[PDB]
Amino acid sequence: MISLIAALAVDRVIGMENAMPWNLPADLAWFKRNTLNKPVIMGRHTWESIGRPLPGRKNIILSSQPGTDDRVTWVKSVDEAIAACGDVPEIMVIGGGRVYEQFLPKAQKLYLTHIDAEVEGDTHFPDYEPDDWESVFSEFHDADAQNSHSYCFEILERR
Ligand SMILES: NC(=O)c1ccc[n+]([C@@H]2O[C@H](COP(=O)([O-])OP(=O)(O)OC[C@H]3O[C@@H](n4cnc5c(N)ncnc54)[C@H](OP(=O)(O)O)[C@@H]3O)[C@@H](O)[C@H]2O)c1
Ligand SMILES: Nc1nc(=O)c2nc(CNc3ccc(C(=O)N[C@@H](CCC(=O)O)C(=O)O)cc3)cnc2[nH]1
Ligand SMILES: [Mn+2]
Ligand SMILES: [Mn+2]
Ligand SMILES: [Mn+2]
Numbered sequence: 001m002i003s004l005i006a007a008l009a010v011d012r013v014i015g016m017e018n019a020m021p022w023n024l025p026a027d028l029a030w031f032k033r034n035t036l037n038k039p040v041i042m043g044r045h046t047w048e049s050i051g052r053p054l055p056g057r058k059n060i061i062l063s064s065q066p067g068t069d070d071r072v073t074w075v076k077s078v079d080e081a082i083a084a085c086g087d088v089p090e091i092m093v094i095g096g097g098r099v100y101e102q103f104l105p106k107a108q109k110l111y112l113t114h115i116d117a118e119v120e121g122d123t124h125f126p127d128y129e130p131d132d133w134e135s136v137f138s139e140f141h142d143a144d145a146q147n148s149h150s151y152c153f154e155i156l157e158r159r
Helices: 025-035 044-050 078-085 097-106
Strands: 002-008 013-015 040-043 059-062 073-075 091-093 109-115 133-141 151-158
Touching: 002 013, 002 025, 002 097, 025 109, 025 151, 040 044, 040 078, 040 097, 044 059, 059 078, 073 078, 078 097, 091 097
Parallel strands: 002 091, 002 109, 040 059, 040 091, 059 073
Antiparallel strands: 109 151, 133 151
Protein backbone atom coordinates (compact mmCIF):
# COMPACT_ATOMS: atom_id res chain seq x y z
CA MET A 1 0.00 0.00 0.00
CA ILE A 2 1.16 3.50 -0.88
CA SER A 3 0.24 6.48 1.28
CA LEU A 4 1.02 10.19 0.89
CA ILE A 5 1.61 12.44 3.89
CA ALA A 6 1.70 16.22 3.59
CA ALA A 7 0.94 19.48 5.40
CA LEU A 8 -1.02 22.04 3.35
CA ALA A 9 -1.48 25.74 3.99
CA VAL A 10 -4.24 27.73 2.30
CA ASP A 11 -4.65 27.03 -1.43
CA ARG A 12 -2.70 23.74 -1.08
CA VAL A 13 0.63 25.54 -0.66
CA ILE A 14 3.34 23.20 0.63
CA GLY A 15 6.59 25.12 0.15
CA MET A 16 8.40 28.28 -0.79
CA GLU A 17 12.03 28.60 -1.92
CA ASN A 18 12.71 24.94 -1.00
CA ALA A 19 11.56 25.49 2.58
CA MET A 20 8.48 25.24 4.74
CA PRO A 21 8.28 28.67 6.43
CA TRP A 22 5.92 27.79 9.27
CA ASN A 23 6.76 25.93 12.46
CA LEU A 24 4.11 23.58 13.89
CA PRO A 25 5.72 21.15 16.35
CA ALA A 26 2.49 19.21 16.81
CA ASP A 27 2.36 18.49 13.08
CA LEU A 28 5.99 17.34 12.99
CA ALA A 29 5.17 14.98 15.87
CA TRP A 30 2.23 13.64 13.85
CA PHE A 31 4.52 13.18 10.86
CA LYS A 32 7.02 11.22 12.96
CA ARG A 33 4.40 8.97 14.51
CA ASN A 34 2.89 8.11 11.13
CA THR A 35 6.23 7.50 9.37
CA LEU A 36 8.49 5.86 11.99
CA ASN A 37 9.53 2.30 11.09
CA LYS A 38 8.24 2.68 7.51
CA PRO A 39 10.11 3.48 4.30
CA VAL A 40 9.86 7.08 3.17
CA ILE A 41 10.17 8.15 -0.47
CA MET A 42 11.10 11.73 -1.30
CA GLY A 43 12.34 13.78 -4.21
CA ARG A 44 15.80 15.26 -4.32
CA HIS A 45 14.62 18.80 -3.54
CA THR A 46 12.86 17.60 -0.40
CA TRP A 47 15.98 15.65 0.61
CA GLU A 48 17.95 18.90 0.34
CA SER A 49 15.27 20.80 2.28
CA ILE A 50 15.30 18.33 5.19
CA GLY A 51 19.08 18.31 5.09
CA ARG A 52 19.79 15.00 6.86
CA PRO A 53 18.44 11.43 7.03
CA LEU A 54 15.25 10.84 8.97
CA PRO A 55 16.13 8.35 11.74
CA GLY A 56 14.27 5.09 12.18
CA ARG A 57 13.01 5.02 8.58
CA LYS A 58 14.47 3.72 5.34
CA ASN A 59 15.07 6.93 3.33
CA ILE A 60 14.65 6.54 -0.44
CA ILE A 61 15.52 9.50 -2.67
CA LEU A 62 14.39 9.90 -6.26
CA SER A 63 16.86 11.57 -8.58
CA SER A 64 17.81 11.17 -12.22
CA GLN A 65 21.46 11.65 -11.25
CA PRO A 66 23.77 9.43 -9.19
CA GLY A 67 23.43 9.65 -5.45
CA THR A 68 25.78 11.71 -3.30
CA ASP A 69 25.28 10.16 0.16
CA ASP A 70 25.33 6.46 1.07
CA ARG A 71 23.37 6.98 4.28
CA VAL A 72 20.21 6.86 2.12
CA THR A 73 19.06 4.83 -0.89
CA TRP A 74 18.98 6.48 -4.33
CA VAL A 75 16.66 5.40 -7.13
CA LYS A 76 15.95 6.68 -10.62
CA SER A 77 12.25 5.88 -11.22
CA VAL A 78 8.95 5.42 -9.42
CA ASP A 79 8.96 1.67 -9.98
CA GLU A 80 12.49 1.36 -8.61
CA ALA A 81 11.53 3.43 -5.56
CA ILE A 82 8.63 1.10 -4.81
CA ALA A 83 10.79 -1.99 -5.31
CA ALA A 84 13.50 -0.64 -3.00
CA CYS A 85 10.96 -0.54 -0.16
CA GLY A 86 10.62 -4.31 -0.20
CA ASP A 87 7.60 -6.21 1.09
CA VAL A 88 6.21 -3.82 3.68
CA PRO A 89 2.58 -3.07 4.57
CA GLU A 90 2.76 0.70 3.99
CA ILE A 91 5.07 2.93 1.96
CA MET A 92 5.06 6.61 2.91
CA VAL A 93 5.56 9.21 0.20
CA ILE A 94 6.74 12.44 1.79
CA GLY A 95 6.91 14.78 -1.22
CA GLY A 96 7.58 17.23 -2.65
CA GLY A 97 5.15 18.54 -5.24
CA ARG A 98 6.51 16.69 -8.24
CA VAL A 99 6.78 13.42 -6.33
CA TYR A 100 3.28 13.73 -4.88
CA GLU A 101 1.90 14.19 -8.42
CA GLN A 102 3.46 10.93 -9.58
CA PHE A 103 2.40 8.81 -6.61
CA LEU A 104 -1.14 10.15 -6.09
CA PRO A 105 -2.71 7.81 -8.71
CA LYS A 106 -1.08 4.85 -6.97
CA ALA A 107 -2.03 5.85 -3.43
CA GLN A 108 -4.73 4.33 -1.25
CA LYS A 109 -4.42 6.71 1.71
CA LEU A 110 -3.69 10.39 2.32
CA TYR A 111 -2.53 11.77 5.67
CA LEU A 112 -3.19 15.51 5.33
CA THR A 113 -2.68 18.32 7.79
CA HIS A 114 -4.71 21.39 6.88
CA ILE A 115 -3.04 24.47 8.39
CA ASP A 116 -4.96 27.74 8.79
CA ALA A 117 -2.14 29.89 7.45
CA GLU A 118 -1.77 32.05 4.35
CA VAL A 119 1.56 31.30 2.71
CA GLU A 120 3.00 32.63 -0.47
CA GLY A 121 4.35 29.52 -2.07
CA ASP A 122 5.89 28.12 -5.20
CA THR A 123 4.92 24.45 -4.63
CA HIS A 124 1.45 22.93 -4.22
CA PHE A 125 -0.02 19.61 -3.31
CA PRO A 126 -1.80 18.06 -6.32
CA ASP A 127 -5.33 19.04 -7.17
CA TYR A 128 -6.87 15.71 -6.31
CA GLU A 129 -10.49 14.79 -7.03
CA PRO A 130 -12.51 14.99 -3.78
CA ASP A 131 -15.11 12.46 -4.91
CA ASP A 132 -12.43 9.76 -4.99
CA TRP A 133 -11.62 9.97 -1.25
CA GLU A 134 -13.47 9.19 1.98
CA SER A 135 -12.52 10.96 5.19
CA VAL A 136 -12.01 8.32 7.88
CA PHE A 137 -10.39 10.46 10.58
CA SER A 138 -10.30 14.14 11.38
CA GLU A 139 -9.02 15.95 14.45
CA PHE A 140 -9.07 19.75 14.80
CA HIS A 141 -6.73 21.70 17.07
CA ASP A 142 -6.80 25.37 17.94
CA ALA A 143 -3.56 27.34 18.03
CA ASP A 144 -1.68 27.31 21.35
CA ALA A 145 1.58 28.59 22.81
CA GLN A 146 3.62 26.08 20.80
CA ASN A 147 1.62 26.03 17.55
CA SER A 148 0.83 29.45 16.15
CA HIS A 149 -1.89 28.34 13.69
CA SER A 150 -4.88 26.07 14.03
CA TYR A 151 -4.64 22.80 12.17
CA CYS A 152 -6.64 19.74 11.23
CA PHE A 153 -5.26 16.20 10.93
CA GLU A 154 -7.21 14.18 8.34
CA ILE A 155 -6.85 10.67 6.96
CA LEU A 156 -8.55 9.88 3.65
CA GLU A 157 -8.90 6.58 2.02
CA ARG A 158 -9.54 5.99 -1.68
CA ARG A 159 -13.19 4.94 -2.08
N1 LIG B 1 4.39 20.73 3.40
C1 LIG B 1 4.77 19.50 3.06
O1 LIG B 1 4.12 18.55 3.42
C2 LIG B 1 5.96 19.26 2.21
C3 LIG B 1 6.41 17.96 1.99
C4 LIG B 1 7.51 17.76 1.19
C5 LIG B 1 8.12 18.85 0.58
N2 LIG B 1 7.64 20.08 0.78
C6 LIG B 1 8.24 21.23 0.07
O2 LIG B 1 8.15 20.90 -1.33
C7 LIG B 1 9.20 21.60 -2.02
C8 LIG B 1 9.99 20.61 -2.87
O3 LIG B 1 9.09 20.06 -3.86
P1 LIG B 1 9.50 20.02 -5.41
O4 LIG B 1 8.27 19.67 -6.17
O5 LIG B 1 10.26 21.24 -5.76
O6 LIG B 1 10.54 18.83 -5.50
P2 LIG B 1 10.56 17.28 -5.11
O7 LIG B 1 9.34 16.63 -5.61
O8 LIG B 1 11.00 17.15 -3.68
O9 LIG B 1 11.90 16.83 -5.88
C9 LIG B 1 11.87 16.80 -7.32
C10 LIG B 1 13.14 16.09 -7.78
O10 LIG B 1 13.00 14.68 -7.52
C11 LIG B 1 13.55 13.92 -8.58
N3 LIG B 1 12.50 13.12 -9.19
C12 LIG B 1 11.16 13.26 -9.07
N4 LIG B 1 10.51 12.34 -9.73
C13 LIG B 1 11.46 11.54 -10.32
C14 LIG B 1 11.43 10.41 -11.14
N5 LIG B 1 10.26 9.83 -11.53
N6 LIG B 1 12.59 9.89 -11.51
C15 LIG B 1 13.73 10.43 -11.12
N7 LIG B 1 13.87 11.49 -10.36
C16 LIG B 1 12.72 12.04 -9.98
C17 LIG B 1 14.20 14.92 -9.54
O11 LIG B 1 15.54 15.07 -9.07
P3 LIG B 1 16.73 15.41 -10.12
O12 LIG B 1 16.54 16.90 -10.51
O13 LIG B 1 17.97 15.14 -9.35
O14 LIG B 1 16.55 14.39 -11.30
C18 LIG B 1 13.35 16.18 -9.30
O15 LIG B 1 14.03 17.39 -9.66
C19 LIG B 1 10.04 22.30 -0.94
O16 LIG B 1 9.55 23.63 -0.77
C20 LIG B 1 9.70 21.50 0.32
O17 LIG B 1 9.88 22.27 1.49
C21 LIG B 1 6.61 20.31 1.56
N1 LIG C 1 2.19 16.64 8.13
C1 LIG C 1 3.39 16.82 7.56
N2 LIG C 1 4.13 17.76 8.12
C2 LIG C 1 5.34 18.06 7.68
O1 LIG C 1 6.03 18.94 8.22
C3 LIG C 1 5.84 17.28 6.54
N3 LIG C 1 7.06 17.52 6.08
C4 LIG C 1 7.48 16.80 5.08
C5 LIG C 1 8.86 17.01 4.52
N4 LIG C 1 9.76 17.79 5.39
C6 LIG C 1 10.18 17.48 6.67
C7 LIG C 1 10.92 18.38 7.41
C8 LIG C 1 11.33 18.05 8.67
C9 LIG C 1 11.01 16.82 9.26
C10 LIG C 1 11.50 16.47 10.62
O2 LIG C 1 12.37 17.13 11.18
N5 LIG C 1 10.94 15.41 11.21
C11 LIG C 1 11.32 14.87 12.52
C12 LIG C 1 10.46 15.51 13.62
C13 LIG C 1 10.26 14.75 14.91
C14 LIG C 1 9.41 15.62 15.80
O3 LIG C 1 9.44 16.82 15.67
O4 LIG C 1 8.63 15.09 16.75
C15 LIG C 1 11.09 13.39 12.37
O5 LIG C 1 11.87 12.58 13.07
O6 LIG C 1 10.21 12.96 11.66
C16 LIG C 1 10.27 15.91 8.51
C17 LIG C 1 9.86 16.25 7.24
C18 LIG C 1 6.65 15.82 4.52
N6 LIG C 1 5.44 15.57 4.96
C19 LIG C 1 5.01 16.29 5.99
N7 LIG C 1 3.75 16.09 6.52
MN1 LIG D 1 10.82 1.99 -15.88
MN1 LIG E 1 7.42 -7.94 -3.32
MN1 LIG F 1 -3.20 31.24 10.84
